[PDB]
Write an enzyme that holds these catalytic residues in place. Structure first.
Site, PDB file in Angstrom:
ATOM      1  N   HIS A   1      40.198  35.661  41.854  1.00  0.00           N
ATOM      2  CA  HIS A   1      40.448  37.087  41.744  1.00  0.00           C
ATOM      3  C   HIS A   1      39.279  37.840  41.145  1.00  0.00           C
ATOM      4  O   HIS A   1      38.559  38.533  41.871  1.00  0.00           O
ATOM      5  CB  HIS A   1      41.761  37.392  41.016  1.00  0.00           C
TER       6      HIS A   1
ATOM      7  N   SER B   1      43.475  46.514  42.377  1.00  0.00           N
ATOM      8  CA  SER B   1      42.332  46.177  41.528  1.00  0.00           C
ATOM      9  C   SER B   1      41.016  46.154  42.316  1.00  0.00           C
ATOM     10  O   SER B   1      39.948  46.451  41.757  1.00  0.00           O
ATOM     11  CB  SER B   1      42.551  44.883  40.754  1.00  0.00           C
TER      12      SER B   1
ATOM     13  N   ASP C   1      39.238  40.964  33.882  1.00  0.00           N
ATOM     14  CA  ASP C   1      39.922  40.387  35.026  1.00  0.00           C
ATOM     15  C   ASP C   1      40.272  38.928  34.712  1.00  0.00           C
ATOM     16  O   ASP C   1      40.574  38.618  33.544  1.00  0.00           O
ATOM     17  CB  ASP C   1      39.029  40.532  36.279  1.00  0.00           C
TER      18      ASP C   1
END
Lengths: 317, 10
Positions: free
Chosen positions: A60, A252, A29
């Site tokens: 994120h 995701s 990620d």
């Protein structure tokens, strides 16, 4: 009290059967700003050669990691799917090609002993374009068929770089997954069923409008208006935006729930192969009409069923 | 680097 996903997925009930202890999940990620509640360990930085994966400059990866394995707290209702896993952070993507770095980081996460690997990356190509990712294909083969890693990847979100695929044409019996209609190829999404590719649904249990559809979508999970943990390990539910707070949405995060489930299934049934963990997850999903479709694959995951149903084991490979 | 994620109370 509970984030809607926690209640929807019956996470507390599921955690009566497993918590992910003994399982290591790699998070490929934007990196992770670690904390007691999101105790990720450095798994490498593949964007900047200096740095180690423990820096999230994109708000994120930190939240992806928390959905998978964020620990509970006595003062709020958030907990990840599998609050007992080890978490490895590999920074492979950052806004603040990448297919080359993806192959490397997949091999590296496997070599670090990750038994579940979550990939947020979703690269889109015109269907007409010539695609060359032999070494990614090789990396995934190695990680799965040799190292026995379950790999869960995002369906991908519609956007500028990425246009939605039309549904299959019902009048061609031999193309049930609508290959002939594909306009956008998503990768590593198109490696399903070898990996498991996860689309997003809303609170109404319906496919998110931003969720990329395709012949490769394998399952689905909550991916809208979510709650997760921030840079301090504290509940967060938005990122600041130009015209206000933007909720936490993305395939995701949907993938992240499935990686968490995979780690639960792994602890509870430690002898299953990746293919058998995948099968156990998809076989117990709430199937769409037709049993499979391009939007939710085998359907929305059901952690309690996944942990408790007895099903014939699929092939080991 | 983008600004940190935040919490919006219900």
């Amino acid at each position: 009290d509970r984030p809607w996903a926690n209640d929807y997925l019956r996470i507390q009930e599921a955690q009566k059967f497993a918590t992910g202890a003994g399982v290591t999940v790699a998070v490929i990620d934007t990196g992770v700003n670690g904390s007691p509640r999101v105790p990720a360990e450095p798994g490498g930085d593949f964007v900047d050669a200096a740095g180690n994966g423990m820096s999230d400059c994109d708000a994120h990866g930190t939240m992806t990691a928390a959905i998978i394995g964020g620990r509970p707290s006595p003062t709020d209702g958030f907990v990840g799917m599998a609050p007992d896993v080890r978490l490895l952070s590999l920074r492979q993507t950052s806004v603040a090609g990448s297919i080359r770095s993806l192959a490397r980081s997949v091999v590296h996460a496997a070599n670090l002993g990750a038994q579940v690997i979550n990939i947020s990356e979703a690269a889109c190509y015109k269907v007409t374009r010539r695609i060359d990712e032999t070494s990614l294909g090789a990396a995934i083969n190695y990680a799965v068929n040799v190292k026995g890693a379950v790999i869960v990847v995002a369906a991908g979100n519609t956007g500028q770089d990425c246009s939605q695929n039309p549904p299959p044409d019902p009048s061609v019996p031999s193309d049930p997954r609508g290959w002939r209609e594909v306009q956008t190829i998503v990768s590593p999404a198109w490696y399903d069923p070898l990996v498991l590719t996860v689309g997003s649904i809303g609170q109404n249990g319906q496919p998110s409008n931003f969720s990329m559809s395709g012949p490769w979508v394998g399952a689905a999970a909550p991916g809208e208006n979510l709650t997760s943990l921030g840079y301090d390990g504290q509940p967060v539910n938005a990122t600041p935006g130009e015209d206000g707070p933007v909720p936490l949405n993305g395939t995701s995060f949907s993938a992240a729930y499935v990686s968490g489930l995979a780690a639960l299934v792994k602890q509870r049934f430690p002898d299953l192969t990746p293919a058998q963990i995948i099968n156990r997850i998809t076989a117990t999903a709430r199937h769409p009409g037709g049993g499979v479709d391009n939007y939710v694959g085998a359907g929305v995951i059901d952690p309690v069923a996944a942990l408790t149903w007895e099903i014939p084991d699929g092939p080991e490979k | 680097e983008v600004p940190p994620p935040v919490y919006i109370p219900p």
